[PDB]
Amino acid sequence: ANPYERGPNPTDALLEARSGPFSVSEENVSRLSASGFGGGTIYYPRENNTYGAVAISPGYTGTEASIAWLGERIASHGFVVITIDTITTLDQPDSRAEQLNAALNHMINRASSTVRSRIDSSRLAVMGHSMGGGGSLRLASQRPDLKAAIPLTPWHLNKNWSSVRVPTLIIGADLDTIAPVLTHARPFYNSLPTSISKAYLELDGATHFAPNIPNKIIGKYSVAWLKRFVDNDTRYTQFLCPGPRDGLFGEVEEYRSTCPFLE
Template sequence: MITASLIARADEQLYTLQPSITPELAVAGQYTVGVQTLKVTHEKQLDTQTFTSQKDRPLTLEVWYPADAQAANTPTATYENVTRLHKPFSLVGKAHRDASPQASGQFPLVVLSHGYTGYRTIMFYLGEHLASHGYVVVGIDHTDSTTGDVDFVNSGFSGFPSTLINRARDQQFVLDYFSQDSSNIAKIADTKDAAVIGYSMGGFGAINTIGACYDFNQAGLQRLGFPEEAAKQLVPVFNSCNAGRESVDPRWKAMIAYAPWGGETSVHDAKSMANITVPSLYVSGDQDDVSGYENGVKKLFEQTGSDNKYLMVYENARHNIAPHPAPKVAYETDADLGHYIEPSWDNEQLNRVNMHMSLAFLECFVKSDQSKCAYLPTRDNATQVKDSDGKLSEAWPGFADRWATGIRFYHGANAK
């Protein structure tokens, strides 16, 4: 069976066909999806220009949610953004702009957090997909850290201090905001059962949000480019636990970290990592040249104390395992294309596997749907291979036979 395209690009098709080999849980759910853009303010946050005062922190949010079924008769949304080199592009999604949300129901809140540099819709395929299966998903434009904020050519790390300080705090703020808001979307958002999904620096923050403490020292900050005296003064500023809270917010029921940064530089305190209890899924390429694998993402996975921890590894993939496929304009320069493309993988296939496994994980640990837990491989190194008798090993649950390849999966502490 061949189904319709997942996403279309404004100037051409972004995803062309969804073939029958698509993992089972990557197929859209029962809900029509709406999307709205919100402007919110996190008041009295640390001014990361001076580090001595406070100022209000504006945030732009993209919110996907189960919509009124009649929304299907309205046009689909366009997502506009810029590349790292500030070249504008538009993508057409499957969601319906400003559609009325479902009149009733409770749908778990999922926070979606981009990397440095990125934007709130860089994983819009995942936001739309989860919403179609009954989640309210909130993508954050992390102020100072987006492609629009940062002059990648002339001052590529200008927003990095803000990223280190605010990534987890932004995630926690979104959960708090929707628990207090009175909008029609907030009324159907279940903030008592929430999850956070982060990519790269979003994953760095997500680990802190669910319980890790930062352990920046002066030498580490200097390696990141801070002058000696500034690094010395900023150590206590940067170090915090639980997104700046005294303890982990118990509403966080699951965490997914795609290519999270920080393992190679040991910025997460190992003792606090061992105390994490939130179910955690790490996703990495085994050739990640930004966050690292052996001493990076794999290390973070191994340090995590949760009884329910998983690691999914894309063989021969580097860092770009989570973004939507590159828009046409990104192909004009290596600097932009390198923000999206994977040399050994088709990004469309990566997106579909991400959709499948993210949904399985959230359904299992946020909605407590035991039938979906069965989609999480239980044997380590579960890539499909030919056995000594010449027969293929069993495919992953939800994957077509012969197509469960190129991906390794680990449950527990035995990643090799």
């Protein structure tokens, strides 16, 4: 038995629903209380248990409102999730990496006892939009103990992520003009090692802002990746391997992976 399995055996409907099977509560993190980031919102399952924890960063000029839906959706599948504001809206990716790390340490050490009692501090993940996604790659390269990273339409001047040893799903947007996939997402994916669990999902008919509103594909595969790697939950491998169908008449523009993933 894997002790980290939470919730029912998954279906496409379970992952495409607007909410997961867990009811969620929220805790505000004031900018005054936040050490090393700008505050945020913690979403957590009401059901008392331990869960993996996830920190999510917005991008340049972005606020926590740009990523709130995804914190709430992921928490509803059995995770403790913090959506942050950064110290300033103009912070660069490597500053965002430090703020992600600070947000993980906040959830583990400084949130309410209601939140801290629901966290398995050994099972952590990071995500982010745009510069936030660049920050996710940077922190993942520094912290091989993270269980997953999910950069969403990532932006970073560093193209070489050969040092990353964390299971990483990069989601790109085909029509992205801010972080074009030819110069950001695809080079990032191609530089990740062939020896890690990794995937690249390029959305069809998507701008750079696709992650900022509820999106069935982003929510399905984000949750499947977190389940597979944060919870070691091999019930979710079915969604990732061989993964969504791509090209002409597909669900996505492109999907690449290193399937099969080691257990």
